[PDB]
mmCIF file of C-alpha atoms and ligand atoms in Angstrom:
data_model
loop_
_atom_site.group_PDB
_atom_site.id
_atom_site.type_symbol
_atom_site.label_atom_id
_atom_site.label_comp_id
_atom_site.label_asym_id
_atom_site.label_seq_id
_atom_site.Cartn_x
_atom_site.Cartn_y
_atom_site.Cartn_z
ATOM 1 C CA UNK A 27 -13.425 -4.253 20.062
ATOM 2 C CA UNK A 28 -9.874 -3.542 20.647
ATOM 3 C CA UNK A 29 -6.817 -5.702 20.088
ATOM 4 C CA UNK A 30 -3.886 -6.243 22.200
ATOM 5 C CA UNK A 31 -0.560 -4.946 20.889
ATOM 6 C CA UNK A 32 2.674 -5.166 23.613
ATOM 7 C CA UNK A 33 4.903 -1.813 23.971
ATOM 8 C CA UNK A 34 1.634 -0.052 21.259
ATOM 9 C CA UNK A 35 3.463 3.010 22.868
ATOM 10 C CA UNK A 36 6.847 2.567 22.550
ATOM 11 C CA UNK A 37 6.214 3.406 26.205
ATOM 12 C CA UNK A 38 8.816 0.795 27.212
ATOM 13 C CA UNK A 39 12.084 1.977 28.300
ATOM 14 C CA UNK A 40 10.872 4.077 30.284
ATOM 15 C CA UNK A 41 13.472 7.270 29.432
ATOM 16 C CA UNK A 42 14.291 10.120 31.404
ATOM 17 C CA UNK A 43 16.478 12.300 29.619
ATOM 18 C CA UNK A 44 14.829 14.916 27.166
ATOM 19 C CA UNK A 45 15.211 13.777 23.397
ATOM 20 C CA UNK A 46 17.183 10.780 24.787
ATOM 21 C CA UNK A 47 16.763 7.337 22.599
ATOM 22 C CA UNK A 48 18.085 3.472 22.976
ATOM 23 C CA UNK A 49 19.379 1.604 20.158
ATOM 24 C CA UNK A 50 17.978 -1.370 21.163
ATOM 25 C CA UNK A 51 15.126 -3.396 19.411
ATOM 26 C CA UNK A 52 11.680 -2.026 21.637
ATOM 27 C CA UNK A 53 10.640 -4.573 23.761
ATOM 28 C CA UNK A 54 7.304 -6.794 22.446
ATOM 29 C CA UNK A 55 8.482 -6.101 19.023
ATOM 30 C CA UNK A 56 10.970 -7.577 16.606
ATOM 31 C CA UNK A 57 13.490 -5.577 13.863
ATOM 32 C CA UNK A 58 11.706 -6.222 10.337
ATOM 33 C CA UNK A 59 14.319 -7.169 8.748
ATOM 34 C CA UNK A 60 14.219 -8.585 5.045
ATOM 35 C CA UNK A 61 17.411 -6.887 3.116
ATOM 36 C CA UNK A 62 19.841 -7.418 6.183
ATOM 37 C CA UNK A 63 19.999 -3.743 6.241
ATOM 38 C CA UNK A 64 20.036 -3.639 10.196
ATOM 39 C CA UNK A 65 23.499 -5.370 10.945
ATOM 40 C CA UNK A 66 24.156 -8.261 13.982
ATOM 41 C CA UNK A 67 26.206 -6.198 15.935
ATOM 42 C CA UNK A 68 24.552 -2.582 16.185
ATOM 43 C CA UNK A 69 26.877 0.223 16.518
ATOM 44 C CA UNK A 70 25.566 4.013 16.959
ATOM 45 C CA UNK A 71 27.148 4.942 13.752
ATOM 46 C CA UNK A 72 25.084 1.837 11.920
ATOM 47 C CA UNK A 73 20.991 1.516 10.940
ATOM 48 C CA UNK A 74 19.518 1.357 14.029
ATOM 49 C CA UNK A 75 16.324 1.070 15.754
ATOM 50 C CA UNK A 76 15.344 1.745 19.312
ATOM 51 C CA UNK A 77 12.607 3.951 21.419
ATOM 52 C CA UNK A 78 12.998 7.856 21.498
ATOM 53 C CA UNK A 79 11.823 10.647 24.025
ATOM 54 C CA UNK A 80 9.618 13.321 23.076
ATOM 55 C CA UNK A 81 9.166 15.567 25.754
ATOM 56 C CA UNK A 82 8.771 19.754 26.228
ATOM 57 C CA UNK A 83 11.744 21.263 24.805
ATOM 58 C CA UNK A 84 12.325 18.423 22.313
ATOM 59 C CA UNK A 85 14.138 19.416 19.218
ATOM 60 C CA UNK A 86 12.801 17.416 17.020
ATOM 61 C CA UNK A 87 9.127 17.786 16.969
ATOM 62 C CA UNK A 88 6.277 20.928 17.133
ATOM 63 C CA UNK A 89 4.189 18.862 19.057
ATOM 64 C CA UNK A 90 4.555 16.184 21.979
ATOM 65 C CA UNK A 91 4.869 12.745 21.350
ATOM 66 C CA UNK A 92 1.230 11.711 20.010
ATOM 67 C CA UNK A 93 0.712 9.315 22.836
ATOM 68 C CA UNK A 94 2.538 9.215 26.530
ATOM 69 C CA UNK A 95 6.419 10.266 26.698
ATOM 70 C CA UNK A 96 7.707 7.772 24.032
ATOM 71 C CA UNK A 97 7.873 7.157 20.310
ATOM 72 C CA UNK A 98 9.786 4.196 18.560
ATOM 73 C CA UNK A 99 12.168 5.071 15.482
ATOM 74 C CA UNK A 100 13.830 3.168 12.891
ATOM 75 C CA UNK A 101 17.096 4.574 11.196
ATOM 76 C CA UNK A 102 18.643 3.626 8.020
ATOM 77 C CA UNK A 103 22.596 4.053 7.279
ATOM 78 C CA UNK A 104 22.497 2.676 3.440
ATOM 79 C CA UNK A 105 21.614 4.625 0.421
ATOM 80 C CA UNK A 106 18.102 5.136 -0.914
ATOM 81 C CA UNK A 107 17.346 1.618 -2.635
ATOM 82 C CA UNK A 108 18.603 -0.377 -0.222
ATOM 83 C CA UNK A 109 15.758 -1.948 1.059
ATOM 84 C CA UNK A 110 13.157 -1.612 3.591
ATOM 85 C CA UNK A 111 13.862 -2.846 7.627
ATOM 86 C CA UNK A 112 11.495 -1.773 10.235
ATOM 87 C CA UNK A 113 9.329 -3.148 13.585
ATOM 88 C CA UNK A 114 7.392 -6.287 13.058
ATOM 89 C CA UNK A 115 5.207 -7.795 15.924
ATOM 90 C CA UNK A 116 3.035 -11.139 15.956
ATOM 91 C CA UNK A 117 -0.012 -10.941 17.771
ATOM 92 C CA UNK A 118 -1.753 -13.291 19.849
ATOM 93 C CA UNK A 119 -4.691 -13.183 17.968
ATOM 94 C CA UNK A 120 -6.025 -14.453 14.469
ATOM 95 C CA UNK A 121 -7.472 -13.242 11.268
ATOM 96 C CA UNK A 122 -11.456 -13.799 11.785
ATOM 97 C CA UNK A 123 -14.422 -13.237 8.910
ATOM 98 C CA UNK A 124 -16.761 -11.102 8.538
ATOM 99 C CA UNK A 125 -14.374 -8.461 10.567
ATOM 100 C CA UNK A 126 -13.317 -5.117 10.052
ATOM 101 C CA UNK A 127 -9.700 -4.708 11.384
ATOM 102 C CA UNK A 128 -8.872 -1.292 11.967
ATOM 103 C CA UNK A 129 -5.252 -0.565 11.882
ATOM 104 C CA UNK A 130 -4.015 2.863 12.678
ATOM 105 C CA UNK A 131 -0.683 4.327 13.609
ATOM 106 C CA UNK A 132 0.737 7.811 13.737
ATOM 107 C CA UNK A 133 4.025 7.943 11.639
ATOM 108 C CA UNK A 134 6.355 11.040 12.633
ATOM 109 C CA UNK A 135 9.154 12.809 10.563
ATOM 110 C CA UNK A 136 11.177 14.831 13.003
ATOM 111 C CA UNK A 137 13.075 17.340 11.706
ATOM 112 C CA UNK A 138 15.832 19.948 13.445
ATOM 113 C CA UNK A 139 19.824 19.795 13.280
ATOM 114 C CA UNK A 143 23.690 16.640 10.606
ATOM 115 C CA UNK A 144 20.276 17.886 9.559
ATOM 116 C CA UNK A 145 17.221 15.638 9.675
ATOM 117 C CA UNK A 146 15.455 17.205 7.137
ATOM 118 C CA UNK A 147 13.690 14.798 4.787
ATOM 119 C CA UNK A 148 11.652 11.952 5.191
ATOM 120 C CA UNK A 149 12.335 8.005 3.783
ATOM 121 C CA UNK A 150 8.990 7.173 3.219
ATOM 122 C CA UNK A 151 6.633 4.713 5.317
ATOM 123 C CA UNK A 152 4.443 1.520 4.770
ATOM 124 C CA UNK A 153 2.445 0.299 7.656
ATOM 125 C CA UNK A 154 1.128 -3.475 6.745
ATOM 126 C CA UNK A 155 -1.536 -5.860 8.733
ATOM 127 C CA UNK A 156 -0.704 -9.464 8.229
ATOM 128 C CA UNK A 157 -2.465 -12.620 8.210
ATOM 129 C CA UNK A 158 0.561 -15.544 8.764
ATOM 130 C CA UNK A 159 3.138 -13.930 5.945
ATOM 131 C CA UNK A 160 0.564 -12.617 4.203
ATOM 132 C CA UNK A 161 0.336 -8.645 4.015
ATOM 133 C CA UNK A 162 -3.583 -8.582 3.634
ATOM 134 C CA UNK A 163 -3.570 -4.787 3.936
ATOM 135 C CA UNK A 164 -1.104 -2.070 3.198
ATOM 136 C CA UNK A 165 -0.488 2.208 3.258
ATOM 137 C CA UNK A 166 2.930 2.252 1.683
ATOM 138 C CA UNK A 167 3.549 6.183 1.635
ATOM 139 C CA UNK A 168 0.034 7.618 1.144
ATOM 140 C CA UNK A 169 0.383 10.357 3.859
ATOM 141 C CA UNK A 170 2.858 13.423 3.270
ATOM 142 C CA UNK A 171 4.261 14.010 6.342
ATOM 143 C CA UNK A 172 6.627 17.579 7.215
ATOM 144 C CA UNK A 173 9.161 17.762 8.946
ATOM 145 C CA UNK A 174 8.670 18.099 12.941
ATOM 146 C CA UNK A 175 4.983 16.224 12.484
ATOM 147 C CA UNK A 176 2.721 13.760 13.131
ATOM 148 C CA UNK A 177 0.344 12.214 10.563
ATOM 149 C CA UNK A 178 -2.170 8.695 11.451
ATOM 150 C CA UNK A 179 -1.762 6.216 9.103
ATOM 151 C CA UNK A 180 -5.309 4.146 8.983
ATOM 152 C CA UNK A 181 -5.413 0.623 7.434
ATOM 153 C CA UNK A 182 -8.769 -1.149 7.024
ATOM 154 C CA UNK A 183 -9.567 -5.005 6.263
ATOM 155 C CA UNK A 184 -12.394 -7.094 5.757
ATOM 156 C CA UNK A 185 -12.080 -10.851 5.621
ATOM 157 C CA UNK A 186 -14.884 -12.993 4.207
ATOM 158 C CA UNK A 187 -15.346 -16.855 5.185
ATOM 159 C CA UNK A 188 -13.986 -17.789 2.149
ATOM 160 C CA UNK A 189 -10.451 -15.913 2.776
ATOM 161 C CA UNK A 190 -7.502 -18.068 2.920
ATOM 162 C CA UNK A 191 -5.683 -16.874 5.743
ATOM 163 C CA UNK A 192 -8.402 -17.305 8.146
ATOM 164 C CA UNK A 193 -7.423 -18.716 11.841
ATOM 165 C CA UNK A 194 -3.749 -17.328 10.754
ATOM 166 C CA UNK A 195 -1.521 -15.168 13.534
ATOM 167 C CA UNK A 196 -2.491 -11.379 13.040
ATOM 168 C CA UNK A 197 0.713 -9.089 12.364
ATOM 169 C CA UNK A 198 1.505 -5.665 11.960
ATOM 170 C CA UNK A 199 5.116 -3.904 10.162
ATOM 171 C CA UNK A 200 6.104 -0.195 10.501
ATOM 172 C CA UNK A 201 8.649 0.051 7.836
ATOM 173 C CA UNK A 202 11.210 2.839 7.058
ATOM 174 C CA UNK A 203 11.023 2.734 3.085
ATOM 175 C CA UNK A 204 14.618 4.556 2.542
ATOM 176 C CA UNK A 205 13.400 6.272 -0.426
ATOM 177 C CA UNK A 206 14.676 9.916 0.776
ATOM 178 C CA UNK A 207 16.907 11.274 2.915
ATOM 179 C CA UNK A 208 17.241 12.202 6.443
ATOM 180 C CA UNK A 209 16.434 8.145 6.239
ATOM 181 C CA UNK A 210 14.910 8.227 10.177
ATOM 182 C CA UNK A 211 11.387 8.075 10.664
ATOM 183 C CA UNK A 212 9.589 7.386 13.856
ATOM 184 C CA UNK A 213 5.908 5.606 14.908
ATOM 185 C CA UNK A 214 3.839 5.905 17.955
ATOM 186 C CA UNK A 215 0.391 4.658 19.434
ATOM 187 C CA UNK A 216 -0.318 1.479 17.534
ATOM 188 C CA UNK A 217 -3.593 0.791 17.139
ATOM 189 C CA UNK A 218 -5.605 -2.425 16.008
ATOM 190 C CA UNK A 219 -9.452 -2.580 16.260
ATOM 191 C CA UNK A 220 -12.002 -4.996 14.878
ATOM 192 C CA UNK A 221 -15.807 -4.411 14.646
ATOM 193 C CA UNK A 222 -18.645 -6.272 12.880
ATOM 194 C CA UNK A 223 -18.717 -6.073 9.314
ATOM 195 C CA UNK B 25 -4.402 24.691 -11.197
ATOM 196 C CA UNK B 26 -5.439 21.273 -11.021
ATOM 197 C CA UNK B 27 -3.911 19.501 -14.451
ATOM 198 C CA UNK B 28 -4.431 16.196 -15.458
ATOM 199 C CA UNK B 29 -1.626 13.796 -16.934
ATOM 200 C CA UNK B 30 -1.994 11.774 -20.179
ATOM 201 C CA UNK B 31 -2.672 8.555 -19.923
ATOM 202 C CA UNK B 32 -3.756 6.266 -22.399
ATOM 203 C CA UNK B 33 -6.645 4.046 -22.785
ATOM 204 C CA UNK B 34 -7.044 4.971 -19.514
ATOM 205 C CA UNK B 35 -10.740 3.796 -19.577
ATOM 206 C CA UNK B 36 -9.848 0.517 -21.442
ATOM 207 C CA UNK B 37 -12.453 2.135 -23.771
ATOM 208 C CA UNK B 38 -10.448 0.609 -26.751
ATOM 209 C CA UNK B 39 -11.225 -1.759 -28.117
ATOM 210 C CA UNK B 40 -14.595 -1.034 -28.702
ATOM 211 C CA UNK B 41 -16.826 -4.041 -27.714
ATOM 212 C CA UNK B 42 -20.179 -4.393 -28.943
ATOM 213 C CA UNK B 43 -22.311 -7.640 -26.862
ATOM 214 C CA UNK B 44 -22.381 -7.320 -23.333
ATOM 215 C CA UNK B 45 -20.345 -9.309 -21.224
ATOM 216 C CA UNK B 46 -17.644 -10.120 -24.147
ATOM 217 C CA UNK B 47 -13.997 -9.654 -23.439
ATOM 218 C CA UNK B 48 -10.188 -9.776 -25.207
ATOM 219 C CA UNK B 49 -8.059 -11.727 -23.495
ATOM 220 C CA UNK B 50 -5.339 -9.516 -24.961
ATOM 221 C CA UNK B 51 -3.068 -7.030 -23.268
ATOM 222 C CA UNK B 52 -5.006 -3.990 -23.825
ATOM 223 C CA UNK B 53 -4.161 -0.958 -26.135
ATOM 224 C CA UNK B 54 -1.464 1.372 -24.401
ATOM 225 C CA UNK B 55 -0.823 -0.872 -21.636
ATOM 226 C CA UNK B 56 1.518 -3.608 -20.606
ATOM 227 C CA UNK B 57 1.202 -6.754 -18.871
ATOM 228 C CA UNK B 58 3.131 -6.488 -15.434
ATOM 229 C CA UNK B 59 4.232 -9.984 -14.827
ATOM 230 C CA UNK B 60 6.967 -10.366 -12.528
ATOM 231 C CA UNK B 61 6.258 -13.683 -11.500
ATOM 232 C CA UNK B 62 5.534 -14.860 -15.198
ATOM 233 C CA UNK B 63 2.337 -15.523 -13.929
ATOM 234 C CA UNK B 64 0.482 -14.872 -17.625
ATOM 235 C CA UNK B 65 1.466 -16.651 -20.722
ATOM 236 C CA UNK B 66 1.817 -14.987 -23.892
ATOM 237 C CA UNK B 67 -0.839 -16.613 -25.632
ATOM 238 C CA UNK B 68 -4.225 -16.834 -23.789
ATOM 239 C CA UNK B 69 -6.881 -19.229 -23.670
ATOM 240 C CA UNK B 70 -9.839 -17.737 -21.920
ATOM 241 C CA UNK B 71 -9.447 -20.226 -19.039
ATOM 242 C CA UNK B 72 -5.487 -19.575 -18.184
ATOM 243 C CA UNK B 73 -4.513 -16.219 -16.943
ATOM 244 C CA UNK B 74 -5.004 -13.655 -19.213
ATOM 245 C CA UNK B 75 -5.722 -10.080 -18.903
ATOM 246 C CA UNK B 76 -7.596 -7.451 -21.510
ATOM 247 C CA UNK B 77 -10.804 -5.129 -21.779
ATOM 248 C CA UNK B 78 -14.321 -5.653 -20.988
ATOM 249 C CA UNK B 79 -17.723 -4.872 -21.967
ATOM 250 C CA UNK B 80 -20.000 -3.684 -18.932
ATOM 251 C CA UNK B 81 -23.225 -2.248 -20.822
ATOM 252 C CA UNK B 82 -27.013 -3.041 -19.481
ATOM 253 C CA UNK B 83 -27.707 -6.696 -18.463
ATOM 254 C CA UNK B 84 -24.315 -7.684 -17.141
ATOM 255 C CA UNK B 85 -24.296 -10.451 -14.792
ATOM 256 C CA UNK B 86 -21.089 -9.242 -13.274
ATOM 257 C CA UNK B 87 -22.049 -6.294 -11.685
ATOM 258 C CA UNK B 88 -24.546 -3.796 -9.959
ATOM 259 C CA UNK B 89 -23.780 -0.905 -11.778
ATOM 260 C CA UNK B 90 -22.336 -0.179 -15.195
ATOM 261 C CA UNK B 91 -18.774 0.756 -15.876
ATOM 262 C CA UNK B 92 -17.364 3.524 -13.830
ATOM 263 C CA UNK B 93 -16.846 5.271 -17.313
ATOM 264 C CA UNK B 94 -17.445 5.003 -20.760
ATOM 265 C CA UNK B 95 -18.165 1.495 -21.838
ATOM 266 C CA UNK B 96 -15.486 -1.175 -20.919
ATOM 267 C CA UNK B 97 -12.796 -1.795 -18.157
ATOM 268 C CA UNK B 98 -9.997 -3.345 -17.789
ATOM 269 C CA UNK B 99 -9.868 -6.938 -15.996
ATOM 270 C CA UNK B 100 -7.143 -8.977 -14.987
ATOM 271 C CA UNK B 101 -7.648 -12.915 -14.175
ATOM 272 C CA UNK B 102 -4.680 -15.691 -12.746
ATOM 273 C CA UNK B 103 -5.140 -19.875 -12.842
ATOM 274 C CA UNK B 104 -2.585 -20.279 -9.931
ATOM 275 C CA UNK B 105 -3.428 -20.766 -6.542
ATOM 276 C CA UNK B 106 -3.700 -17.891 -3.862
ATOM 277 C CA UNK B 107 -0.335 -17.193 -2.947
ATOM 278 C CA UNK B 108 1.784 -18.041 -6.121
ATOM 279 C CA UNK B 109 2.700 -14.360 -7.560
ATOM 280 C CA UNK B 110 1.082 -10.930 -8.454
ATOM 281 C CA UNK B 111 0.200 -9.339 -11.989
ATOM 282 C CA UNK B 112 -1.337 -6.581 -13.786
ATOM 283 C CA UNK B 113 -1.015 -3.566 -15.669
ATOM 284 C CA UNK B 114 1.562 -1.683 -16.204
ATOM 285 C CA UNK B 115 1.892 1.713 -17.897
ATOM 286 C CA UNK B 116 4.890 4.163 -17.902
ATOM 287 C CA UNK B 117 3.628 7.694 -18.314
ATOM 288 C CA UNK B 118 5.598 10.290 -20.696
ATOM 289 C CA UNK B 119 5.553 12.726 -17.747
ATOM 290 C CA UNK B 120 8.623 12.804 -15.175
ATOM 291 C CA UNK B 121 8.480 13.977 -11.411
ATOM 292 C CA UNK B 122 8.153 17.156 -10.645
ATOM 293 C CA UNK B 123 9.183 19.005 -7.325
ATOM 294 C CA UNK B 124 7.041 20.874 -4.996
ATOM 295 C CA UNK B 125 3.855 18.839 -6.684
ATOM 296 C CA UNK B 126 1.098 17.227 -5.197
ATOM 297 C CA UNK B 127 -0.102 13.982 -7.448
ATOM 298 C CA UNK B 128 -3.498 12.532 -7.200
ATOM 299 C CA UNK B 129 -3.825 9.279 -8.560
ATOM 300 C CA UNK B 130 -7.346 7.625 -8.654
ATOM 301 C CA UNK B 131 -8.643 4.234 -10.004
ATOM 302 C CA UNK B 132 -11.545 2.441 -9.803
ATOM 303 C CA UNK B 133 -11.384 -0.929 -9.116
ATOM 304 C CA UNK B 134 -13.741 -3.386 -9.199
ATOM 305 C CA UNK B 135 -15.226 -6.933 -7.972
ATOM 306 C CA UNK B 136 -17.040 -8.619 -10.329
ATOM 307 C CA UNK B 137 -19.345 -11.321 -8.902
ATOM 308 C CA UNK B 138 -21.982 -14.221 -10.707
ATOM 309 C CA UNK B 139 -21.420 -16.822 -12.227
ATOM 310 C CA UNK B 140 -19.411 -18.435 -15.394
ATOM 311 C CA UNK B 143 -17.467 -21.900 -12.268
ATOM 312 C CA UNK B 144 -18.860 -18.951 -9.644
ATOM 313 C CA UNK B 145 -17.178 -15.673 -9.553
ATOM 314 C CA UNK B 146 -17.997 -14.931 -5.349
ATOM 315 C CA UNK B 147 -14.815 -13.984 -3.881
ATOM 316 C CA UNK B 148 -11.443 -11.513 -4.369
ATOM 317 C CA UNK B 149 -7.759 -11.777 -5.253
ATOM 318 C CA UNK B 150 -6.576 -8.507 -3.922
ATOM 319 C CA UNK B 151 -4.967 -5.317 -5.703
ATOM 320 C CA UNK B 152 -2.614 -3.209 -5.283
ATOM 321 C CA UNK B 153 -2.361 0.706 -7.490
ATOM 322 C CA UNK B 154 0.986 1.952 -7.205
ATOM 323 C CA UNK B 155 2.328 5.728 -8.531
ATOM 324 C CA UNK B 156 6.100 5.038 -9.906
ATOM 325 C CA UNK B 157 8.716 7.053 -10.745
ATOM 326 C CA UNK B 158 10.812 5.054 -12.700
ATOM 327 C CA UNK B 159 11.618 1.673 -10.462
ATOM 328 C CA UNK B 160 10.406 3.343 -7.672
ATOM 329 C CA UNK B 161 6.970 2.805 -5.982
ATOM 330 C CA UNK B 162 6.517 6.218 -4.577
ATOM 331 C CA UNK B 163 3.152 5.637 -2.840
ATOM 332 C CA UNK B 164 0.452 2.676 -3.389
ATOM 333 C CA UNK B 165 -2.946 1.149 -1.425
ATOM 334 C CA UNK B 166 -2.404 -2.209 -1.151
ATOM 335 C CA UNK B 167 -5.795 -3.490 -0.715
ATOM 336 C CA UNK B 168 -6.935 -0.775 1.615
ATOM 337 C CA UNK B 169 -10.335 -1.042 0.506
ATOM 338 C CA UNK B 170 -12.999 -3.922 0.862
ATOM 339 C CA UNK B 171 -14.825 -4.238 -2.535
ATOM 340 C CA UNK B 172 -18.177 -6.684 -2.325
ATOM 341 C CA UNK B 173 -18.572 -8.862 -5.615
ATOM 342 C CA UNK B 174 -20.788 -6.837 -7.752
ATOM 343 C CA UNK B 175 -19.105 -3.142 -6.876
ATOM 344 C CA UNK B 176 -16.735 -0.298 -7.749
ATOM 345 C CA UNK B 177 -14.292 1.315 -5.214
ATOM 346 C CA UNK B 178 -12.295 4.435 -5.702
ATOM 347 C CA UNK B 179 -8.904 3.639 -4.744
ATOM 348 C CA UNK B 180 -6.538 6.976 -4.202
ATOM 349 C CA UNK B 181 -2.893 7.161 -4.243
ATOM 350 C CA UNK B 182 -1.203 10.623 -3.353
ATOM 351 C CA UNK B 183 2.144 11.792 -2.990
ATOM 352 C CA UNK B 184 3.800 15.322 -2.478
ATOM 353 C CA UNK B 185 7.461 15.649 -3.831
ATOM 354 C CA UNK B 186 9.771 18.080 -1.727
ATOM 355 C CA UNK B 187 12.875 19.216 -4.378
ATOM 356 C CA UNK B 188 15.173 16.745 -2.380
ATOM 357 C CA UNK B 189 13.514 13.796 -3.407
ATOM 358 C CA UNK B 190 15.512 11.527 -4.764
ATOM 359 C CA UNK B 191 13.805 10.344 -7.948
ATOM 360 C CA UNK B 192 13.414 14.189 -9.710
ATOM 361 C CA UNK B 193 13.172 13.596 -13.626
ATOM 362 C CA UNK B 194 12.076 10.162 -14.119
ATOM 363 C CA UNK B 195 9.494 9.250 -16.011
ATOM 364 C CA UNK B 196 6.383 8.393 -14.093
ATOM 365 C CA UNK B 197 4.296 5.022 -14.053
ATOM 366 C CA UNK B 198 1.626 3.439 -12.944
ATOM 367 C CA UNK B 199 0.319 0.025 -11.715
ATOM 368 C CA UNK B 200 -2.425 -1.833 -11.424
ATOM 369 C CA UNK B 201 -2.053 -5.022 -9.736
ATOM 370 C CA UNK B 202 -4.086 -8.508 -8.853
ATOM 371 C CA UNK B 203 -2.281 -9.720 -5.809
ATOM 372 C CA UNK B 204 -3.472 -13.364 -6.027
ATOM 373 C CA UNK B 205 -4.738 -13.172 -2.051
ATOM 374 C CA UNK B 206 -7.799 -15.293 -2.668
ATOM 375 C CA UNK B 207 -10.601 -16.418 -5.461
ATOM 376 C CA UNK B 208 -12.371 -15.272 -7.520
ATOM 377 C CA UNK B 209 -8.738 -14.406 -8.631
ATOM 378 C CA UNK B 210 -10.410 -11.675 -11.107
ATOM 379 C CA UNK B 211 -10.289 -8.006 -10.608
ATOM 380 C CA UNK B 212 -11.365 -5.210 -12.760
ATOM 381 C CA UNK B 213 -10.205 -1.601 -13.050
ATOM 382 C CA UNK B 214 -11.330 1.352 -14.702
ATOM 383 C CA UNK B 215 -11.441 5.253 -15.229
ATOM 384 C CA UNK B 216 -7.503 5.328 -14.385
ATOM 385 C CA UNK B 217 -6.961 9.323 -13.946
ATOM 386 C CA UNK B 218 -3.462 11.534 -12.538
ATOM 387 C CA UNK B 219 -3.708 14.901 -11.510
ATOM 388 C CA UNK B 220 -1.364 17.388 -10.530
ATOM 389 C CA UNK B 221 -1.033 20.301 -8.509
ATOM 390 C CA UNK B 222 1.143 22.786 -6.141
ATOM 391 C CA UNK B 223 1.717 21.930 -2.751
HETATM 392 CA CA1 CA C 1 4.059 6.697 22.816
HETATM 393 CA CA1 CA C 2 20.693 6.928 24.846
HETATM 394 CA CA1 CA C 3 12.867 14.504 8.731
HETATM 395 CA CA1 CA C 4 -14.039 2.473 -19.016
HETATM 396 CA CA1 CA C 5 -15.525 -11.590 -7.402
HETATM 397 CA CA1 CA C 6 -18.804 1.908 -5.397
#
């Protein structure tokens, strides 16, 4: 009924430090990629990606973290228009018919003080091979210092092309707004019975 | 206050269409063809990709209900093979975005299903809410639609005053994503609202 996802958390680094963050691609997931927007060699000052700490006292959130200490970001330097760049992760599993896939994820927009006020916009995909069967590009509006869960649903049929082709999910940062940072947590992927 | 925005043809109500299960293959009135991937010639042969309108009245093979609304709606069809390019509609609005408003787009789309060369099966769609080149918000195929049936796809979106795209005009798309066949879709009763957030 459930799906395995590695690092669904962002649990991994484990981080000590309140509102600490790396700047290092989370483990069990790749940098999405597509407009070259997140350079070869990182720097703190360039787009960025990496796993965050939300813990009491955090600055940058009314709540906790929706799920254990840890939530993974992705940062954009470039203007709005840019591009898209994100997390990406291939799963060990494949798209089967007559199944409901169940995708949900809980996209944050932390705010506080540079102020981070402002959100660049999300889309949340499910793949089949390169194939985004299923999408929520930036159907949620999120505020500043919460959490909303983004759900994505899809039903394949026998005749569906992309059967028996590697499952995928992308958390994207959309950079269409400003503070371009945005943040994801708790990864979800479930399949029932049609 | 909950206003709506004009849109028209919205129900691909014209043309009017009088024997069930007759089509245009022609763009339809107050729309545009969104073809990106010049999927869709310019002259259409009932058999290549074409879009238009569609009659859905009592005794139509292609679905289990009548039209959503009013009479017709609005199909799109592609030749190619899954995985060769998306079209659609397209439709820039004479409206512009607006801060501090909450916009409720909602379409139906639909699956058509029977046969024709057997019409089992789904390409896909996407409805996207534009503000000029920019897709604001959109379902991409968030919804599973059985051959035969309607669902209500709904985009929203909430502008803050530092958004970036303020003043320009706003649009809207309506897209077969060429994901699998039947590559036909239909759509229908196309309707934006606004209100205060
Ligand atoms: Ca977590
Ligand atoms: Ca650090
Ligand atoms: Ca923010
Ligand atoms: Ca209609
Ligand atoms: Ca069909
Ligand atoms: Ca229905």
């Amino acid at each position: 009924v459930s799906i395995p996802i590695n690092n669904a958390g962002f649990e991994d680094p484990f981080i000590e430090v309140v509102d600490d963050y790396t700047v290092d691609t989370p483990p069990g997931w790749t940098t999405y990629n597509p407009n070259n927007l997140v350079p070869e060699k990182r720097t703190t000052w360039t787009s960025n990606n990496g796993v965050g700490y939300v813990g009491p006292g955090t600055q940058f959130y009314n709540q906790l973290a929706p799920e254990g200490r840890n939530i993974g970001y992705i940062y954009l330097a470039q203007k709005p228009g840019s591009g898209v760049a994100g997390f990406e992760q291939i799963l060990d599993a494949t798209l089967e018919p007559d199944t409901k896939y169940t995708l949900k994820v809980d996209v944050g927009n932390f705010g506080g003080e540079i102020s981070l006020a402002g959100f660049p916009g999300y889309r949340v995909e499910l793949l089949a091979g390169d194939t985004v069967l299923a999408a929520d590009h930036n159907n949620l509006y999120i505020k500043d210092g919460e959490f909303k869960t983004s759900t994505v649903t899809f039903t394949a049929t026998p005749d569906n092309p992309y059967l028996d082709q590697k499952l995928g999910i992308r958390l994207i940062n959309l950079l269409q707004g400003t503070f371009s940072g945005l943040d994801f947590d708790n990864v979800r992927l479930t399949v029932e019975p049609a």
